[PDB]
Enzyme design. Structure first.
Site, short mmCIF file in Angstrom:
data_model
loop_
_atom_site.label_atom_id
_atom_site.label_comp_id
_atom_site.label_asym_id
_atom_site.label_seq_id
_atom_site.Cartn_x
_atom_site.Cartn_y
_atom_site.Cartn_z
N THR A 251 -6.95 -3.88 1.18
CA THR A 251 -5.18 -4.88 1.04
C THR A 251 -5.83 -4.43 2.93
O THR A 251 -5.80 -3.24 3.14
CB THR A 251 -4.37 -3.46 0.78
OG1 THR A 251 -3.42 -4.51 1.34
CG2 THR A 251 -4.19 -2.51 1.05
N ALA B 288 -10.76 -2.56 -5.60
CA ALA B 288 -11.97 -1.34 -4.57
C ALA B 288 -13.31 -1.30 -5.18
O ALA B 288 -14.58 -0.87 -4.48
CB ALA B 288 -11.45 -0.10 -4.91
#
Lengths: 200, 200, 213, 113, 263, 196, 224, 206, 196, 200
Positions: free
Chosen positions: G26, G74
């Site tokens: 993020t 991720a």
């Protein structure tokens, strides 16, 4: 759940198993499925337990009140009609199949067979519940006319044993009730007394 | 959604109630001064945790009833009774639940005995002797308090314990934080402190 | 109609000091609302210097731990040396990602010594994003364990406190106490506590008791 | 086509909030029908007529609608003087918590509006 | 100022209104969100027997929010009447409020009557309420007590159905508890024997279930004595803490402090 | 969607809204006064789904005016905010509330300027500045950056201009004009429309 | 034998809650002023509402010529830039010249174009100083590959767009650009709930990136 | 999805071997269709096997698992599949079948006595495999496992007679409180001597 | 979405596309050259969903260039249009086509200017003018109004300016700049960007 | 659909109804459900018609080929195993329940009862199809050991009549087949010959 009733000469013989499943687990295994509506009138409960229990209690209320007002024992057909009304107005909200059977002075032993839906029809013998499918053929083949009380009891015990050995929602002890003019003579067939049929 | 977290802790004639300060729509911090601890007495606070639209409604639904109670009876309410009417107010909307889980913490007005409790969104009294928690960060406060809590802690150690529980539990939850408020209720005085928390 | 997955529960925790790397886990194998067994440890010994601990779906735990052992043997055969901790972690990330579209529902934490003998702990996810951390906890109770470890090991949110290096004895005390606390509130954790202490002198195991309920 | 009262419409609502919305809200009338059918069928038409006839004149004079009311005589006419349920403890009409202008509430009771 | 809007709130009793907010606040479900609390499941192994001249009830004392042990001493043997008690399983709040209202109804009945209430009365009240509410009030109860007509034991299911048995078990650990009864139960046990049997039966539901486990409660109701044994046994104790965390003074930083002298 | 923004300074409140009223890929009108005058010193910025915004704002406006005329004095901004919140919360039931996102901005001779944020769930919260619509995401950081509790009117208006310019730079929708009014000790003051 | 897990089941040449998970990424950022590109990102990675880690290095260190960026998922990122780094190194081995940023972005885009709508959640942002000058591309999971002066992606990308746009200028001297990136990421993590931790800062100067600083938002909050 | 299933398999360790039991019935839903099938295999001279769930898949396993035993005994070297080896092979087979979304709908209980140390393993349709002194499948895990574990926690080592009686008592409990059960069950006992299956055994209750 | 437009005159083709490349409520870049040069005299305006547009356009561009270099002459505009249609139609099966809306504009020394419209189903159709995106609805009437088969270049460009101005006036999305190129007997000619 | 088979001393007696419903309409009412796999081996088909027909044809192919290769009559167990393989590998794609029964020199009359799913189990008597539920009890109550050919035929006819009178997916004419060492002696019971049981 294999409730059963037969009309013999001068009275009626009920019959039921005792097994209340909540899936595959046996919540209660000595259930008394023969609820006495009146002194000489009985019902047999099949389906969801709560609906049948509430309906039987409501009917015994209405029928006791009616009997008091008429100052007479109620006709079995009256109890059958009272069951029919409640089972038909709320046919969507109920899952009850009842085998109202009893004796009254006018018409003798009667067996009415209110199914799921609200029908009311008279039968010489009526069976119901999940396990009745496995004894339709047996009762069709063995039932005769003019049977006495004793051979009626034997017939009921045999049919119930045949059903309970096959159906998983049916088993335990066999509760019988021989309604006649004098009064109900209940009995419980347990363990060894249940007729056994030699498996291959 | 909105987020939120509150706890309570008992002690030696002192209780501690705490709350985060985040009012955000589902990702978006909007303010950092949302009130979650409401004064319902001299030594009796209630902490709400859940929908901001229902924190603001239950805390006003309940002030109305509480004021009426106090005026009608003329006495400050015992904490247990306040606990018992939150259950009524919440259980009123049993099928329309107010999405909030209050925690009540305070002292008995005439005995100064610590009292804490916690309620689910439909209202189930849960009186504990050590601590209660509520909100999104449900597991984190449980894990922290089950470890740092001790019995018979003097107020400053109580403040340390509850402050650490907040600071380390809200830091591990994304939708709760932006500072911590802590109230230490004593038999004599009320201390309200704002702690140093990560503002991320 | 067939759930290819089921959650068997189980909690793991790792701490990386200076000369050691604690890997600990509860030994309760659960399913829904039943305890299959109380003596199923969730820490496996890979190498004399590296210990893996898996938690989550038990079938994938077994399959993954066997694949990993096979891969260590293949590495030993081709390259003629036992794998380092970092190499094992990178392999595990690759292995986990190979099932990106049918994931290994397991949470893995590698605890052991790196090349220079200092402790190291690698924390994974069901599809293999690994990273080095000084401490970690995964599984059902991870949410209960991680804040307390942040407080006591990382000294988060405390002021004016001496940052003592974490000793092995204090590490054992801390792990035992955090699992005592966790067994209280989490239903999936209890019945024993297998702790593996990975040091330069081998791997020695201590096991204590938790709430049996 | 008006308002200043919450645009009395609810047309979007129509369908109940729950199979337990209308039935539980009006179980008082539902139980009235249950008992009347029990009495029409078995006791007579005189008994339901009596119950309607009385219940009319227990409600005509209790209190004006904008004030709370206890409705005593109605309760010991139905079995409710020793049977207490969820309609007695949850949001009692004593703390009605929402009221309008007195006059405007006492007229509709009779039905001016 | 009594604003002119709703004619009035003339009828309380179970809102709905305010339910479409529940229906369209998926949040928890879809649109991330998901704080959106859910209710409880308290009552996880409750059991009862009918010994020679009375009733013995039992229950664990663990209350689980989700899969986290919320309360560790949640009492599940509720008081109905000075001779009738009732264990409670299923949703927590529903069982609580249902038992409280039935206790109020019952002891109003016994107050106006002037004699001890019968168990069958409480069984009927509970049955008819639950049936009236179509089972949305999930509240499984084990009703027990002793009237002039001897000991009675009922098991009320949420949908309205009730079963009268010499021994019943309910909860998440009901099956594990039923194992002990089906193997060890005999009619006409003495007080100590029945207490031991029920203790084992609840103990089965503690170690062998996840939704249950804590101190064990008992309620021995006889024709003349009522022992509310609480807590009857402490099988599980907190593991002794080894560290000395012991947060010190001044460890936390304070931006603003407000002090208010009360008395 | 659309855009609201509010800034509270020492003794004033600055608010701004777009003027675009779209119905589909087309916009039907470009002079949409999205701003309802509750009283002499209260402004109620209402946005949300079509139809409900105007109806709810009209209801609340008529009630504030009715209170004023029934009593003689006027609702304080905090009173108006709380009453609006109570009204919007109770409609989160039957008449599917109204998805009206509000931003109440007012001044009190006694309490100083006040700005209240309200989502469509009726979650009231006082704030020094706020914004609604998808445009809020782009402007809230810029508001956080150059905002101090003490801001003169000219600094506030140029800050608002900064927010709108960057919203023009990034936001995909076409919002060419924004109506701006300030609220201070002397009623409500219209300001020149910010146009591009 | 039925199936009898053969051996290492299937793992050969992987290179081209119930399990469903992969943490998160993020609030990343990069612009391309005159003295090169600088890349900024936070260090937080959440799992639902629960932070799995506060020290997640989101700026992939592809090679000492070129940087990447993690966002959106991720593991998907980490794996795909790792394979991209492998490919870049193979190319540099064969052709004996460092690969240009334009080529690497197209490699990654083509690699991720396959698996279209199969569940990838990549949000990468390639950066580097190639033979043509600064390089900056936004390669994402659905196949976008666009150059540009300024970019920012993640849950808190919009806040960074705000502050960065009002701070950006192509003739911005280095130390001010550092502060601009710090401020942008700090504001983004201030408003957003999914962004937090330490603000990593990379500078892609002439040959070789460098690491500027890694300040914690807790200390930045006091700093501002 | 299964059609004909078996209910429960019990098994408890004891000093000298392992005893397991399973009733003889296959339910075609709620119907006791087949009432003389056997759900206990003797794998080799040291390991038996029981299984609940789809019976056709169990017969497929009997075909396969049986076949490997012959395939090794013809070799005549002398190495034999130890009980742990069969348990591992079965675990792998069902994990592989699950990974292809075509599971073997079964939950076996492998028991065996080799090298003087007993063995009891559990494998389900999802490859959840482990070892425990006492096992149970289906509603056996709720109605019989609690009694077995209660008896084992007090006395951890059981003789043959006590173990067989404990299994019989647990079978009585299952017969009372399990819908899909029959009163004709088989007990298979392994000792150093070899696998031994007694059946059919009824349940003469009071 | 985005916007393409094409006008065919006597002996030229005028085309124009926006420069905005949005990803969400935010736009990521404002210089997006949406225009792929197939050959010296063919332009391929490609729009649609992200990712597929660029890939399909690159594929077709490489094939036109490959044909040119393998043969020496170049694909005629009708040949390029038909080959692109064949390629896009066959992918309406496996690799879920690519939702690429095309607008092929080219000139042939022999056949005169040509403009081909293509939806995402590969339905080829020559037209004197066309447009894609939601903006096509607003501009097609204006194109119908002032278009004649005989239009000088200056009249065509001012017609395009008229279309874009009205699209600015009505269309809800923010499209501030449009790249314009004309195609005539001498290659492709860039024209000054139409900006607002 | 009430296929039925019983093993008597020295051979087997099959039995089936003839009714192929496609909903509530009787597509074919004289269906021959006794497909001869071999000279002295039979199958009974229940379920979807196409699947059972194709499986029977494939099995008769494989079994004829096998019998030729072995130069011997095939064992009934061999045909049962061949049915089991096809019904088990394609258990998802098939809806066949087969009652393979026949005679072979080694083991005498055999009745295997491959149900839907792939089981293969031997039975002293096997029944299947939709209507078998209504005669489970009858066959359990009436079956004995050592029955001759003739009373086996009578038993089969009675059971099938009981099923067909009750089930709607079962009716028409009763096709029998008495396989023995000598050879099959088929017969069809039609109209009056079907046993009738007096309805009340």
């Amino acid at each position: 759940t294999t409730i059963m009733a037969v009309q013999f000469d001068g009275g009626v013989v009920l019959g039921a198993d005792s097994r209340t499943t909540t899936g595959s687990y046996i919540a209660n295994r000595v259930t008394d499925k023969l609820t006495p509506i009146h002194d000489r009138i009985f019902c047999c409960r099949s389906g969801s337990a709560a609906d049948t229990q509430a309906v039987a209690d409501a009917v015994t209320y209405q029928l006791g009140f009616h009997s008091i007002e008429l100052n007479e024992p109620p006709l079995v057909h009256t109890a059958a009609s009272l069951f029919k009304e409640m089972c038909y107005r709320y046919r969507e909200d109920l899952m009850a199949g009842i085998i109202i059977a009893g004796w009254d002075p006018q018409e003798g032993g009667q067996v009415y067979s209110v199914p799921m839906g609200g029908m009311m029809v008279r039968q010489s013998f009526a069976i119901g519940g999940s396990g009745s499918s496995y004894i339709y053929g047996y009762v069709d083949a063995t039932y005769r006319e003019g049977m006495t009380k004793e051979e009626c009891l034997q017939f009921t015990a045999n049919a119930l044993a045949l059903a309970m050995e096959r159906d998983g929602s049916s088993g335990g002890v066999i509760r019988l009730a021989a309604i006649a003019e004098s009064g109900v003579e209940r009995q419980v067939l347990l363990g060894d007394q249940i007729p056994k049929f030699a498996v291959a | 959604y909105n987020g939120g977290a509150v706890m309570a802790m008992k002690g030696k004639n002192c209780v501690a109630i705490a709350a985060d300060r985040r009012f955000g729509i589902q990702a978006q911090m909007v303010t950092t001064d949302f009130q979650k601890i409401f004064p319902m007495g001299d030594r009796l606070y209630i902490g709400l945790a859940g929908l901001a639209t229902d924190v603001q409604t239950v805390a006003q639904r309940l002030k109305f009833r509480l004021n009426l109670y106090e005026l009608k009876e003329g006495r400050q309410i015992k904490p247990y009774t306040l606990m018992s009417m939150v259950a009524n107010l919440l259980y009123e909307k049993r099928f329309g639940p107010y999405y909030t889980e209050p925690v009540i913490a305070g002292l008995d007005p005439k005995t100064f005995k610590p009292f804490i409790c916690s309620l689910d969104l439909i209202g189930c009294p849960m009186v504990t002797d050590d601590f209660v928690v509520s909100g999104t960060c449900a597991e984190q406060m449980y894990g922290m308090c089950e470890s740092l809590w001790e019995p018979n802690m003097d107020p400053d150690h109580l403040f340390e314990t509850i402050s650490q529980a907040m600071l380390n539990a809200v830091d591990r939850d994304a939708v709760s934080g932006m500072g911590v408020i802590v109230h230490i209720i004593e038999k004599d005085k009320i201390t309200t402190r704002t702690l140093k928390a990560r503002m991320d | 109609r067939f759930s290819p997955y089921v959650f068997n529960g189980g909690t793991i925790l790792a701490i990386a000091g200076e000369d050691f790397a604690i890997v600990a886990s509860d030994t309760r194998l659960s399913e829904g609302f039943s305890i299959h067994t109380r003596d199923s440890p969730k820490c496996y010994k890979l190498t004399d210097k590296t210990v893996i601990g898996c938690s989550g779906f038990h079938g994938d735990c077994l399959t993954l731990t066997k694949i990993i052992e096979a891969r260590l043997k293949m590495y030993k055969h081709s390259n003629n040396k036992a794998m380092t901790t970092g190499a094992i972690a990178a392999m595990l990330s690759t292995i986990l990602y190979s099932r990106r579209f049918f994931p290994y529902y397991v949470y893995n934490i590698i605890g052991g010594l790196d090349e220079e003998g200092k402790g190291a702990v690698y924390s994974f996810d069901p599809v293999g994003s690994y990273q080095r951390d000084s401490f970690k906890a995964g599984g059902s109770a991870s949410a209960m364990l991680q804040p307390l470890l942040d407080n006591q090991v990382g000294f988060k949110n405390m002021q004016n406190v001496e940052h003592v290096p974490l000793s092995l004895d204090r590490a054992m005390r801390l792990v035992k106490d955090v699992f005592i606390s966790a067994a209280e509130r989490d239903v999936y954790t209890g019945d024993a506590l297998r702790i593996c202490i990975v040091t330069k002198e081998g791997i020695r195991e201590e096991t204590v008791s938790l709430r049996k309920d | 086509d008006l308002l200043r009262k919450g645009f009395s419409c609810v047309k979007n609502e129509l369908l109940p909030s729950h199979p337990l919305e209308l039935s539980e809200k009006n179980f008082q009338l539902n139980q009235d029908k249950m008992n009347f059918s029990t009495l029409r069928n078995i006791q007579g038409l005189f008994a339901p007529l009596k119950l309607q006839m009385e219940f009319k004149a227990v409600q005509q004079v209790q209190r004006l609608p904008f004030l709370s009311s206890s409705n005593l005589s109605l309760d010991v006419l139905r079995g409710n003087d020793e049977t207490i349920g969820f309609e007695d403890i949850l949001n009692d009409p004593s703390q009605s918590e929402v009221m309008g202008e007195p006059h405007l509430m006492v007229e509709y009771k009779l039905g001016l509006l | 100022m009594a604003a002119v809007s709703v004619y009035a709130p003339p009828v309380g009793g179970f809102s709905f209104d305010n339910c479409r907010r529940n229906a369209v606040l998926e949040a928890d479900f879809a649109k991330r969100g998901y704080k959106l609390p859910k209710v409880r499941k308290t009552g996880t192994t409750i059991a009862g027997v009918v010994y020679k001249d009375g009733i013995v009830l039992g229950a664990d004392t663990r209350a689980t929010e989700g899969m986290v042990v919320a309360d560790k001493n949640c009492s599940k043997i509720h008081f109905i009447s000075p001779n009738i008690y009732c264990c409670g399983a299923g949703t927590a709040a529903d069982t609580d409020m249902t038992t409280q209202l039935i206790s109020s109804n019952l002891e109003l009945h016994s107050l106006s009557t002037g004699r001890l209430p019968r168990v069958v009365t409480a069984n009927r009240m509970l049955k008819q309420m639950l049936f009236r509410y179509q089972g949305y009030i999930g509240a499984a109860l084990v009703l027990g007590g002793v009237d002039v007509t001897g000991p009675h034991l009922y098991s009320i299911y949420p949908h309205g159905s009730t079963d009268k048995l010499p021994y019943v078990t309910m909860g998440s650990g009901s099956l594990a508890a039923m194992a002990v009864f089906e193997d060890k139960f005999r009619p006409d046990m003495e007080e100590e024997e029945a207490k031991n049997l029920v203790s084992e039966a609840i103990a089965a539901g503690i170690f062998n279930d996840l939704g249950s486990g804590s101190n064990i409660d008992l309620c021995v109701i006889s024709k003349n004595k009522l022992d509310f044994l609480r807590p009857y046994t402490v099988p599980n104790k907190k593991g002794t803490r080894l560290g000395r965390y012991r947060c010190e003074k001044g460890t936390t930083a304070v931006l603003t402090e407000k002090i208010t002298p009360l008395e | 969607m659309e855009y609201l923004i509010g800034i509270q300074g020492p003794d004033y409140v600055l608010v701004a809204s777009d003027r675009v009223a779209a119905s589909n890929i087309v916009q039907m009108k470009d002079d949409h006064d999205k701003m309802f005058k509750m009283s002499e010193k209260i402004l109620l910025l209402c946005v949300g789904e079509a139809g409900d915004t105007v109806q709810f704002a009209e209801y609340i406006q008529k009630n504030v005016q009715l209170y004023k005329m029934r009593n003689g004095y006027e609702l304080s901004p905090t009173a108006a905010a709380n009453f609006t919140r109570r009204n919007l919360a109770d409609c989160l039931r039957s008449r599917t509330p109204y998805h009206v996102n509000l931003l109440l901005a007012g001044y009190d001779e006694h309490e100083g300027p006040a700005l209240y944020y309200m989502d469509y769930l009726a979650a009231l919260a006082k704030a020094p500045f706020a914004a609604h619509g998808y445009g809020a995401f782009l402007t809230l950081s810029i508001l956080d950056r150059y905002y101090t509790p003490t801001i003169s009117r000219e600094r506030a208006v140029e800050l608002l201009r900064k927010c709108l310019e960057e919203l023009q730079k990034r936001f995909i929708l076409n919002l060419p004009t924004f109506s701006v009014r300030i609220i201070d000790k002397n009623g409500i003051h219209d300001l020149d429309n910010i146009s591009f | 034998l039925l199936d009898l897990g053969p051996g290492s089941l299937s793992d050969g040449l992987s290179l081209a809650e119930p399990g469903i998970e992969m943490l998160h990424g993020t609030t990343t950022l990069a612009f391309k002023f005159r003295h090169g590109v600088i890349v900024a990102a936070d260090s937080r990675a959440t799992a639902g509402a629960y932070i799995a880690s506060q020290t997640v290095k989101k700026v992939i260190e592809i090679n000492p010529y070129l940087l990447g960026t993690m966002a959106g998922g991720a593991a998907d990122c980490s794996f795909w830039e790792r394979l991209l780094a492998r490919q870049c190194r193979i190319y540099e081995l064969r052709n004996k010249e460092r690969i240009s940023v334009a080529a690497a972005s197209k490699l990654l885009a083509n690699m991720v174009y396959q698996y279209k709508g199969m569940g990838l959640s990549m949000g990468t942002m390639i950066c580097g100083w190639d033979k043509r000058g600064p390089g900056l591309y936004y390669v994402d999971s659905e196949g976008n590959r666009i150059s540009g002066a300024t970019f920012s992606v993640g849950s808190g990308s919009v806040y960074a767009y705000g502050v960065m746009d009002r701070g950006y200028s192509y003739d911005l001297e280095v130390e001010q650009a550092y502060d601009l990136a710090r401020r942008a990421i700090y504001q983004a993590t201030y408003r957003d709930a999914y962004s937090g931790g330490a603000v990593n800062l990379y500078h892609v100067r002439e040959d070789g990136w460098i690491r500027v600083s890694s300040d914690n938002v807790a200390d930045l909050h006091e700093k501002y | 999805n299964p059609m004909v299933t078996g209910t429960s398999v019990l098994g408890v360790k004891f000093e000298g071997g392992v005893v397991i039991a399973a009733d003889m019935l296959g339910s075609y839903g709620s119907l006791a269709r087949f009432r003389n099938i056997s759900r206990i295999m003797r794998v080799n001279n040291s390991t038996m096997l029981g299984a609940s769930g789809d019976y056709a898949d169990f017969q497929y396993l009997k075909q396969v698992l049986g076949q490997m035993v012959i395939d090794e005994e013809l070799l005549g070297d002398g190495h034999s599949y130890s009980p742990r080896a069969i348990h591992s092979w079965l675990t792998r087979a069902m994990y592989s079948r699950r990974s292809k979304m075509n599971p073997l709908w079964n939950t076996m209980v492998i028991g065996g006595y080799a090298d003087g140390e007993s063995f009891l393993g559990y494998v389900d349709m999802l490859g959840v495999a482990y070892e425990a002194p006492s096992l149970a499948t289906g509603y056996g895990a709720y109605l019989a496992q609690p009694l077995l574990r209660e008896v084992l926690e007090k006395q951890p080592v059981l003789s043959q007679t006590e173990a067989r009686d404990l299994v019989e008592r647990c079978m009585r409990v299952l017969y009372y409180r399990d819908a899909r059960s029959y009163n004709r069950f088989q007990i298979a006992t392994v000792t150093e001597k070899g696998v031994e299956i007694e059946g059919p055994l009824s349940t003469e209750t009071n």
